[PDB]
């Protein structure tokens, strides 16, 4: 049973992460945030939550939405780092895998800044704290995929995922890295994560893969360099779209073909027939993360909390934008499930 | 002495008692703990007011009641001064194995169904009847085990 | 794996040995009844007592670390929960109390039997009774302690989430504790008519 | 007796126990998997709940097969029965129990998949029922073999 | 640095490093970090700048 | 006796049980996996529901082979039967049961793959049926061996 | 009867069962993996369906090897057969069965790989055929050993 | 003899070994887990070092209980002791050893969790101490049962 | 007889069986891994097909070693053979079978690697041949040991 | 004799082996874990090398305990020793050896953790030393128990 | 006789089999690992094939050690050999076989690493040779132990 | 022959085999792990090869301990040896073998870690040597226990 051996190594971790989940903003707290009309009022209301005095070091006039997002995300990062410092064994590997996606983000960010001739220090300061590795600053030396792989990426945990650069090439490399990483993380969950967390993490990683596959299928239509053979190299092989709808999207050239492929799955129909595609994926991710919190002895709670806080920072940043820019008609367009 | 009542038959009678009660407690605990994980999952999302969420836990406990009943009936027939036959010992071992493993299976089914569906019939009362019916179908497995154990106890004593 | 390889090898050896004994006309040489008759009743009684107390303590400690790790994790943000979540620790302790009480009551039966009455009806009965009642109490207590610890972990989590949610999970904990009580009662009934060794 | 040892009822008692044990395991697996599917599907379409109850009923029928064979073996069990009678009862219990265990696993897996599909495709309900009947007849064949064995348990049997 | 230089130069690395006895304060991290004086040998201008 | 020991019916009863038990396990695996495939595919294409049912029917036929051998062994099963008869009944049961278990594994795997592929390629249905026939004849060979053994079970058998 | 004991037919019956059981297991593995490959490649290339059926036929031939040895051992079985005959029948059954199990494993793996690769390279079909013949010849060696052994079973036997 | 066979001291010697070994394993698990927790905690909060040593000491008391029982059953050992006495010493050693094993495992898990929590929440130190006291009385209970058995070991043995 | 008990041919039959069983298992592993390598590389290099077939041929040679030892042990079998003859036959069968199992594993792994490398590098074919020959000599040593044993199985053996 | 069977020294030799074997296993685990920690931390902090070596030394003292008990048991072994002496030597060997295995586990885990932590927290070293003494006395308790047993090995022991 | 039981050659034959079996297993592991390394590195550096072949050669020499012991033991086998001779032959076979198994595992791992690192560092070749010699002397020590045992197998042996 | 049964040399031969088998296993683990460490290190720093060969040499010394004990036990094996002599030889073999197995595991782990660290920090070399010596003393303790046992194996033994 799940609770029999879980608490030997993860009882404290899971209790702390569930306290973090209790810290997620409820619907009433989001409504109170929405009622704010100034960013100082937003800071005041947000101090009545578990964010607390995270903006106390920021003066009233210096307060910007970018600062609010940066400090909320920093709080997220410190909480994740504390939870990972208490982890050992398979839980430590699980949270390292969680960091591997941010590692891929940092690699793509470094290469994007390098080909754009941005300041090296600025790119390093903008790198995600999660997903940092020691040889990350060395990625500025070259604009060649082979040169960076031999120079840096062969020693990183992203080395298994790689089996001059421009914006489209960096995009392709990043999406290939994501496909390989999602497949590897799915395999790791299948083989090394106990059953309730195994099923929850398989569902969550499959949803993430499906979101990426549908995005790639829909965004390759407006491009000509994305060959149908290249689309196969970008679509992950772990989701509910795999392998049927994944194969259908890897060959589609029109929006109707993509929509017909997505009518295959009962989980994602209506995503393309109404609303915004990204709103559907955000709502589904928050629904899945909310359901993952119904499992008590699952380490998938860490991933669910991480995604819920990322969505929470997105929501708070959107509310900050609909406070700063006026635009109070769109202030309620945030995903909330807690 | 009597060949049909060797002095080691109480070993099998007491093994029946132990199997009955231990396996019934194991099933009851599986059901109670897994259903309670479901109940806690209901918490901080949809905290109710009236406690219909305790039905899986109550039926898990009824499994331990089945095992208790069979174990008590077996232990009533076990005495160091009475002629306990080897047939009676095997009958009591069968009583214990029957009721205990049936209650273990009932507890597994009750735990699964409770964990998954107590949330879903507290969220929407329409599913209450169906989920309770599935839970009754999980409970009757232990009921069958106890019925067979009762018949076996009667046969072994006579 | 290796452990499964040993399980298969032991099963194969047992089947081959049993078939060899059966085919050669010596199936009765594997005499479980004679083994039960000639084995010391003291081994059964002492194994029953030791396994009773030891397994009861194993379940108690098991559930204690489950509940306690969850309580300490949930107390980082909600330190209030500790005082009334100690009830779960107490519920896990009561299991080892059951095991200790049964061990005392059963060890009261551990008198010295006379040499010519070592393997009498009553002495063999007492050995089997103490063995199986000790296993019953100890295993029921191990199961009850694990279950009560799991439920107390969920209770600590729910209490940290909301104060009002603790009482329902506490009722679930009481239902879990009934299992250890029933194991106690059945262990007492199984050894109820077991005389001391004479 | 040579033909009726004192341990002869051991095999019959283990047969009865096996009939209950393995059919209960199969029924529990079938009921659990099917119920998980039912609850996962009724979160959106509650009216289909009483339609998806079918695999749980199939698992219950498997358990009833086990109960029937156990009762029959119980009433065939005796203190002075033949070793052949005990072998027959053990074979009957093993056949019904393990056939019903296989049936229950098939029922759990098929019923889970079928209720998931029927929540999406109303026409797949009849296909689910057909596959479930095919998984049910496995336990039925185990039942039939157990009844035939039990009918031959004490037929021309010398004490 | 030695590992990276080995990989970029595809072997063929003549790298020497010597320990500096005293730690040297760095303003970036405000730490008294130990340092090593290193030398690496290569011919082409492109590999020098890399 | 010597040629007919008291324990001789044990092997026959175990063979009778194992026939149905292992053919039921193979039939259950085949039915469960093929049914998962069918439920997956017939969510979108219910028109293929009764074409895709054939692997389930073939697993059921495996179970029928097991039931046939179990009945035949059961009716040749006696208290004073020979040990040779018991060995032959055990061999017949084991052969049919484990050949049917292997055949059911193949039926489940091939039928799952073939119903999932036939939803995309209608021409793949014939290939599925051909591979399923090749899987079914494994249980058929087991049945043939079991019937030959059973025919030799009480022929030229004395004491 | 000292050298023709009552349990002598046990080994013969076990060998007769083992022949067909293990060749059927090998044939089932070969058929299952080759058929998964066939169904995977015939979605896009249904024209190659009857070419890709070859590994399934090789696995079926493995099962036929096992059936042949089972029939021969069965017809050499007797109530008063020699223990040496039973040992030889057990050896023949194990030979053909486990050799055909290995051959079916090889056939399944190689036939899967070859049906997947032949859809991308038509000239790889002959290579897959050669490797499948090599895999089949393993079960053929097992069958040859079983046939020679079965020939020795009642030769000069008292 | 019947009451004093030659192998009777085996159960006493192996009970002494069990009493020390299982309690030492529990205490070592407790010391290792709590000590890793302490090292992790005291990197950033070295002021809590000697306050966090409590779980390690409460793990050591488990091995001390095992040592007590080992000393007792060792001094009750003898070449010509009764099987009654040897099984009494085996029961004492097994009871204390299994209790100390469980108690030390619980002390390790709870002490690790609690030193980490008290690093984050100083109010959790008292709760952690309380849970560790509850975990330690379990080894105490095993010791008590061992004491009862050892006291009864010398009764009427001839 | 004390020297030639009735169960003495059991060891000989088991040695004859295991000689072919384990060599066929090793040869099957070698064939399977080398064939996967071949069918993975020859999609882009179908010309190298008859060169990459070598590891499959060498695994076949391992199986032939097992067959040779099996027929030699089979023809040395007899109802009244010595227990020593049975021991020697079992040792021969085990030697050739398990050395050939090891050789087949080495052949499969090395042949897979070599076929892939030769698809990547033409000059690596000779090195692959050397390593595969070094894998063959393991099964050949097993053959030699088995033949030397079998040449002594009935050498100075008393009834 | 009855009290001194020929196999009585078997348990003594096993106990003498067990003492050193399991204390060396515990010492090896402690040395390996602590040494991995030491080599990890002393790349950046070579000055802390002879300070972090302490868990390795205490792991070695575990094996010294085992060696002492092995010598003391070895010099009490005899051909005509009593079975009670053999049981006592076995119990002492298992006592010291398994208590030392536990102590070596604790020493390795705590030494690794504290050597790594003390690289970032100099104040953590005294805490590591205290925890490691608490781990070492676990094996020292087993040494005490083994020494008491050995003292009683040939005490009041007859042929 | 009492010192030469009929089952004494069983231990000798098992030792003769185990010598070659386990040295061939170690040689197969060494050959497989080293061959994977060689084929992986020679894709880019074919000129190094005949240098990197060395770990495969050393694994082959492990197998040759096993063959030597098997030949000697086989020629020392006899129907009426002593139980002491059988035990000694079993010990020699086990010692050489398992020492060569350990040596072959070390050779496989070290040769894999050293050929994968020698393709990058030519100077690492001599170091890999040195470590491989140290891994080879393990099988050599096992061979020496087996040879000494075999020399004592028939020395001062009576029936 | 009560004190010297015919199976007494079995334990001596098993001890003689195990002394070299398990010490060669420990030496093989030490050599293999230290060797992958050395190869990874000497890719970058080929000049440090002869410094980094120490863990491999030290594992080899463990194997030499095992060889010494195997030779000493072997030259005390006798057909009419005492059962006590065999038990003592088995104990000596187990002592040295499993102590050196633990020592070689510690040596592999610590030598890998220390070679890799001393690649970066040359001051870590002396510390790695210290930990490696502490891992040697485990095998040395096993050797000492085995030598003492062996010295008592044939002392004051009768028939």
UniProtKB/Swiss-Prot annotation, chain A:
Present with 1630 molecules/cell in log phase SD medium. It is a peripheral membrane protein. It comes from Saccharomyces cerevisiae (strain ATCC 204508 / S288c) (Baker's yeast). This is V-type proton ATPase subunit d. The gene is VMA6. It comes from the Eukaryota. One of its GO terms (biological process) is vacuolar transport. Keywords: Acetylation, Hydrogen ion transport, Ion transport, Membrane, Transport, Vacuole. It is found in: Vacuole membrane. InterPro entries: ATPase_csu/dsu_sf, ATPase_V0-cplx_csu/dsu, ATPase_V0-cplx_dsu, V-type_ATPase_csu/dsu, V-type_ATPase_csu/dsu_dom_3. Transmembrane segments: none annotated. GO terms for molecular function: proton-transporting ATPase activity, rotational mechanism. The modification N-acetylmethionine is found at residue 1. V-ATPase is a heteromultimeric enzyme composed of a peripheral catalytic V1 complex (components A to H) attached to an integral membrane V0 proton pore complex (components: a, c, c', c'', d, e, f and VOA1). Belongs to the V-ATPase V0D/AC39 subunit family. Coiled coil: none annotated. One of its GO terms (cellular component) is vacuolar proton-transporting V-type ATPase, V0 domain. Gene3D superfamilies: ATP synthase (C/AC39) subunit, domain 3, V-type ATP synthase subunit C domain.
Curated annotation (Swiss-Prot), chain B:
Gene3D superfamilies: lithium bound rotor ring of v- atpase (1.20.120.610). It is found in: Vacuole membrane. Changing residue 139 to D: Partial inactivation. It comes from the Eukaryota. Residues 32-53, 115-126 are cytoplasmic. GO terms for cellular component: cell periphery; fungal-type vacuole; fungal-type vacuole membrane; Golgi membrane; membrane; proton-transporting V-type ATPase complex; vacuolar proton-transporting V-type ATPase complex; vacuolar proton-transporting V-type ATPase, V0 domain. Signal peptide: none annotated. One of its GO terms (biological process) is Golgi lumen acidification. Keywords: Hydrogen ion transport, Ion transport, Membrane, Transmembrane, Transmembrane helix, Transport, Vacuole. The record marks 139 as: Essential for proton translocation. Residues 75-92, 153-158 are vacuolar. Present with 538 molecules/cell in log phase SD medium. V-ATPase is a heteromultimeric enzyme composed of a peripheral catalytic V1 complex (components A to H) attached to an integral membrane V0 proton pore complex (components: a, c, c', c'', d, e, f and VOA1). The decameric c-ring forms the proton-conducting pore, and is composed of eight proteolipid subunits c, one subunit c' and one subunit c''. PANTHER family: V-TYPE PROTON ATPASE PROTEOLIPID SUBUNIT. NCBIfam families: V_ATP_synt_C. This is V-type proton ATPase subunit c'.
Curated annotation (Swiss-Prot), chain C:
It is found in: Vacuole membrane. Coiled coil: none annotated. The keyword NAD does not apply. Signal peptide: none annotated. InterPro entries: ATPase_proteolipid_c-like_dom, ATPase_proteolipid_csu, F/V-ATP_Csub_sf. GO terms for molecular function: P-type proton-exporting transporter activity; proton-transporting ATPase activity, rotational mechanism. Gene3D superfamilies: lithium bound rotor ring of v- atpase. The keyword Transmembrane helix applies. Keywords: Hydrogen ion transport, Ion transport, Membrane, Transmembrane, Transmembrane helix, Transport, Vacuole. The record marks 93 as: Essential for proton translocation. Its main location: membrane. Residues 21-46, 107-129, 190-198 are cytoplasmic. It holds the Pfam family ATP-synt_C. The chain crosses the membrane at residues 1-20, 47-67, 86-106, 130-150, 169-189. SUPFAM superfamilies: F1F0 ATP synthase subunit C (SSF81333). It is a multi-pass membrane protein. It comes from the Eukaryota. One of its GO terms (biological process) is endosomal lumen acidification. GO terms for cellular component: fungal-type vacuole membrane; Golgi membrane; membrane; proton-transporting V-type ATPase complex; vacuolar proton-transporting V-type ATPase complex; vacuolar proton-transporting V-type ATPase, V0 domain. Residues 68-85, 151-168 are vacuolar. V-ATPase is a heteromultimeric enzyme composed of a peripheral catalytic V1 complex (components A to H) attached to an integral membrane V0 proton pore complex (components: a, c, c', c'', d, e, f and VOA1). The decameric c-ring forms the proton-conducting pore, and is composed of eight proteolipid subunits c, one subunit c' and one subunit c''. PANTHER family: V-TYPE PROTON ATPASE PROTEOLIPID SUBUNIT (PTHR10263). Belongs to the V-ATPase proteolipid subunit family. This is V-type proton ATPase subunit c''.
From Swiss-Prot, chain E:
It is found in: Vacuole membrane. Glycosylated. It comes from the Eukaryota. Present with 55714 molecules/cell in log phase SD medium. Belongs to the V-ATPase 116 kDa subunit family. V-ATPase is a heteromultimeric enzyme composed of a peripheral catalytic V1 complex (components A to H) attached to an integral membrane V0 proton pore complex (components: a, c, c', c'', d, e, f and VOA1). Subunit of the V0 complex of vacuolar(H+)-ATPase (V-ATPase), a multisubunit enzyme composed of a peripheral complex (V1) that hydrolyzes ATP and a membrane integral complex (V0) that translocates protons. V-ATPase is responsible for acidifying and maintaining the pH of intracellular compartments. Is present only in vacuolar V-ATPase complexes; enzymes containing this subunit have a 4-fold higher ratio of proton transport to ATP hydrolysis than complexes containing the Golgi/endosomal isoform and undergo reversible dissociation of V1 and V0 in response to glucose depletion. This is V-type proton ATPase subunit a, vacuolar isoform. It comes from Saccharomyces cerevisiae (strain ATCC 204508 / S288c). The chain holds residues 199 to 248 of 840 of the full protein.
């Amino acid at each position: 049973m799940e609770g029999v051996y879980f608490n030997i190594d993860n009882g404290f971790i899971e209790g702390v992460v569930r306290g973090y989940r209790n810290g997620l903003l409820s619907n009433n707290q989001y409504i109170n945030l929405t009622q704010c009309d100034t960013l100082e009022d937003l800071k005041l209301q947000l101090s009545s939550t578990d964010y607390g005095n995270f903006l106390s070091s920021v003066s009233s006039e210096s307060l910007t939405t970018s600062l609010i997002q940066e400090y909320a995300s920093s709080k997220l990062y410190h909480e994740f780092n504390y939870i990972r410092d208490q982890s050992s064994g398979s839980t430590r590997k699980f949270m390292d895998y969680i960091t591997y996606g941010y590692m891929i983000d940092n690699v793509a960010l470094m290469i994007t800044g390098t080909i754009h001739d941005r300041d090296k220090g600025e790119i390093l300061q903008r790198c995600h704290p999660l997903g940092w590795f020691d040889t990350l600053p060395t990625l500025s030396v070259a604009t060649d995929l082979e040169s960076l792989y031999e120079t840096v990426l062969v020693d990183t945990p992203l080395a298994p995922y790689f089996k001059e650069l421009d914006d489209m090439n960096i995009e392709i490399i990043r999406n290939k890295l994501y496909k390989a990483y999602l497949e590897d993380f799915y395999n790791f969950v299948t083989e090394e994560i106990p059953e309730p967390a195994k099923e929850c993490m398989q569902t969550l990683l499959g949803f993430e893969a499906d979101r990426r596959s549908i995005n790639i299928a829909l965004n390759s239509l407006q491009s000509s360099d994305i060959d149908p053979d290249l689309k196969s190299d970008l679509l992950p092989n772990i989701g509910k779209l795999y392998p049927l709808a994944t194969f259908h999207l890897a060959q589609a050239q029109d929006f109707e073909g993509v929509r017909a492929a997505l009518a295959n799955v009962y989980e994602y129909r209506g995503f393309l027939e109404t609303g915004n595609l990204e709103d559907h994926f955000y709502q589904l991710e928050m629904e899945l993360c909310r359901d993952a919190f119904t499992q008590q002895f699952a380490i998938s709670t860490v991933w669910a909390w991480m995604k819920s806080k990322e969505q929470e920072v997105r929501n708070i940043t959107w509310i900050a934008e609909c406070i700063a820019q006026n635009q109070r008609e769109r202030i309620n367009n945030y995903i909330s499930v807690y | 002495s009597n060949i049909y009542a060797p002095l080691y038959a109480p070993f099998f009678g007491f093994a029946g008692c132990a199997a009955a009660m231990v396996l019934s407690c194991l099933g009851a605990a599986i059901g109670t703990a897994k259903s309670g994980i479901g109940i806690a999952g209901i918490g901080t999302f949809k905290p109710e007011l009236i406690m219909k969420s305790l039905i899986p836990v109550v039926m898990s406990g009824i499994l331990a009641i089945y095992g208790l009943v069979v174990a008590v009936l077996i232990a009533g027939n076990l005495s160091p001064t009475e002629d306990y036959t080897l047939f009676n010992g095997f009958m009591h071992l069968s009583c214990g194995l029957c009721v205990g493993f049936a209650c273990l299976s009932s507890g597994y089914a009750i735990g699964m169904v409770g964990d998954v569906g107590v949330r879903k019939y507290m969220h929407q009362p329409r599913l209450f009847v169906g989920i309770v019916l599935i839970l009754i179908f999980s409970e009757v497995l232990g009921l069958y085990g106890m019925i067979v154990a009762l018949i076996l106890n009667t046969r072994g004593s006579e | 794996s290796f452990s499964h390889f040993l399980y298969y090898l032991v099963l194969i050896v047992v089947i081959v040995y049993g078939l060899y004994k059966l085919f050669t006309g010596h199936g009765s040489d594997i005499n479980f009844g004679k083994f039960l008759l000639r084995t010391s009743p003291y081994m059964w009684a002492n194994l029953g007592i030791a396994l009773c107390v030891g397994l009861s303590v194993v379940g108690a400690a098991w559930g204690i670390f489950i509940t306690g790790s969850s309580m300490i994790g949930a107390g980082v943000r909600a330190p209030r929960i500790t005082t009334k979540n100690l009830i779960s620790i107490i519920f896990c302790e009561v299991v080892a109390i059951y095991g200790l009480i049964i061990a005392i009551v059963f060890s009261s039966k551990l008198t010295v039997a006379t040499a010519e009455n070592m393997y009498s009806k009553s002495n063999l009965y007492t050995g089997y009774s103490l063995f199986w009642a000790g296993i019953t109490v100890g295993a029921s207590n191990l199961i009850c302690g694990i279950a009560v610890g799991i439920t107390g972990a969920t209770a600590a989590i729910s209490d940290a989430a909301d104060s009002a949610l603790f009482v329902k999970i506490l009722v679930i904990e009481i239902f879990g504790s009934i299992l250890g009580l029933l194991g106690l009662i059945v262990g007492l009934l199984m050894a109820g008519k077991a005389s001391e060794f004479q | 007796t040579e033909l009726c040892p004192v341990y002869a009822p051991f095999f019959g008692a283990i047969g009865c126990a096996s009939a209950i044990i393995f059919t209960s395991l199969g029924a529990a697996y079938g009921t659990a998997k099917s119920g998980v599917g039912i609850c996962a599907t009724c979160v959106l379409r509650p009216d289909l709940l009483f339609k998806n109850i079918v695999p749980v009923i199939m698992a219950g029928i498997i358990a009833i097969y086990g109960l029937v064979v156990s009762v029959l073996v119980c009433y065939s069990l005796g203190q002075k029965q033949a070793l052949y009678t005990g072998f027959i009862q053990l074979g009957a219990g093993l056949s019904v129990g393990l056939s019903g265990l296989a049936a229950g696993f098939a029922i759990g897996i098929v019923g889970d998949a079928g209720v998931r599909g029927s929540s999406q495709q109303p026409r797949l309900f009849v296909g689910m029922i057909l596959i479930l009947i095919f998984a049910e007849v496995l336990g039925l064949y185990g039942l039939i073999v157990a009844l035939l064995l039990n009918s031959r348990a004490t037929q021309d049997v010398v004490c | 640095l030695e590992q990276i230089l080995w990989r970029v130069l595809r072997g063929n690395l003549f790298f020497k490093t010597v320990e500096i006895e005293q730690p040297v304060y760095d303003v970036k991290t405000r730490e008294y970090k130990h340092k090593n004086a290193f030398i690496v040998f290569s011919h082409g201008d492109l590999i020098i700048k890399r």
